[PDB]
């Protein structure tokens, strides 16, 4: 309070915006790797605005769905821009979030006191996967039918209530009009849960502030968010919109499959069923197990060892700048997630059955050889001392 007024940004109507978006204290040495988080909140707003206008011309019926998407591309004013922004915009939303996650692994941003910020973001990554999968079915092409068949039948290897799971998810005995109608209703709903879980994920970071490239206690050198990290975030929103415009105007079909331009026929099978590029690493782990019930049970330990990183303790050094051995393991895990994506679009044959079984093992040896440096490393100040 004071006795009379002052700057209007310090009034109750704009206090929550002032103290969290203008005057918020920030470490002064943050690099451009701290810019991909506001870039991911712009990619979520683009998908909501473009999809609300796409849904004014789409019909969720098996006799009318493929022809409603060609009606947008051909007869609606600017309608080809509305579709290409939405199909390619889901690839931009996954490039930005994948570079966000690998920042937090290099600088160990999951550590104390920031465990709830990590665990709220593993829930966000799960809501993004369900939303993109369920929305790839509405165009109703040959890859929108034979991809919803391969994934929803994978719940038929669960013990002995699982044959009642798949025919309740389907609404019948196969993928058909009962399945296309309920996949549309859930697809309008799940982006609005994703919005409320992103505002909650930001209230958990504004309780302790941000980490920095050195990993240290930083409260002695801090500046404000406006104008310093607003004008260098604006350099990032313009470099993004150039890169996004070479995918809409000059190459709008490079990141897709041609088989989704054939209308859906349940009598023949396509020769090769391959997902979008951003589902290729978990598709190669899922096909690496020669048992099917052990394939669903290798996807759930991917999201268990992610949710259980910030609860191992003894590591006082955070940043990989001062840690020369864990830094070399980071570049050796990134080479493995790019090799698991290559395997996930190859035939299931030799030699890709051995080269697709070792990288699922190397991927799970990253989360077990982290805590052993949490033991051998804490005896460094008693040995190297001078």
């Amino acid at each position: 309070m004071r006795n009379q007024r002052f700057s209007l940004l310090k009034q109750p109507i704009s206090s929550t915006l002032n103290q969290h978006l203008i005057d918020y204290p920030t470490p002064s040495n943050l690099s451009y790797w701290w810019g991909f988080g506001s870039l991911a909140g712009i990619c979520l707003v683009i998908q909501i605005v473009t999809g609300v206008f796409l849904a004014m011309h789409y019909t969720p019926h098996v006799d009318l769905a493929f022809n409603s998407v060609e009606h947008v591309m051909r007869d609606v004013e600017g309608g080809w821009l509305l579709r290409y922004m939405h199909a390619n915009g889901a690839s931009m939303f996954l490039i930005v979030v994948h570079l966000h996650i690998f920042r937090g692994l290099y600088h160990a941003s999951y550590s104390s006191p920031r465990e709830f910020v990590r665990c709220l973001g593993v829930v966000i990554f799960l809501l993004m996967i369900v939303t993109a999968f369920t929305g790839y079915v509405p165009p109703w092409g040959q890859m929108s039918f034979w991809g919803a068949t391969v994934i929803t039948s994978l719940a038929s290897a669960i013990p002995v209530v699982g044959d009642t799971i798949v025919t309740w998810l389907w609404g019948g005995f196969s993928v058909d009009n009962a399945t296309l109608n309920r996949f549309f209703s859930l697809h309008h709903l799940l982006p609005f849960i994703l919005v409320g879980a992103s505002l909650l994920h930001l209230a958990a970071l504004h309780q302790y502030g941000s980490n920095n490239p050195l990993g240290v206690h930083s409260e002695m050198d801090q500046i404000s968010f406006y104008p310093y990290f607003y004008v260098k975030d604006l350099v990032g929103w313009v470099a993004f919109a150039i890169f996004f415009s070479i995918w809409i105007f000059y190459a709008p079909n490079v990141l897709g499959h041609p088989d989704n331009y054939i209308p859906a026929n349940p009598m023949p099978t396509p020769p090769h069923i391959v997902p979008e590029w951003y589902f290729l690493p978990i598709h190669a782990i899922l096909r690496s197990i020669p048992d099917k019930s052990g394939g669903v049970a290798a996807i759930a330990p991917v999201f268990i060892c992610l949710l259980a990183l910030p609860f191992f303790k003894s590591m006082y050094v955070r940043s990989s700048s001062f840690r020369p051995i864990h830094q070399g393991i980071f570049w050796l895990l990134l080479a493995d997630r790019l090799l698991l994506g290559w395997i996930g679009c190859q035939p299931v044959e030799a030699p890709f059955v051995t080269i697709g079984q070792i990288p699922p093992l190397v991927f799970f040896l990253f989360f077990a050889i982290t805590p052993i440096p949490g033991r051998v490393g804490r005896g460094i100040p008693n040995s190297y001392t001078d």
Binding site: P159, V160, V161, T164
Partner: peptide
């Protein structure tokens, strides 16, 4: 004391089974 803590706490595991089949009758399993 501390035994009676768990000697209570494992019957809410079972108050929850009187409850877990109370509405759904999960049948096949």
């Amino acid at each position: 004391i501390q035994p009676t803590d768990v000697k209570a706490a494992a019957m809410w595991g079972v108050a929850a089974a009187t409850g877990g089949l109370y509405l759904i009758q999960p049948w096949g399993w």
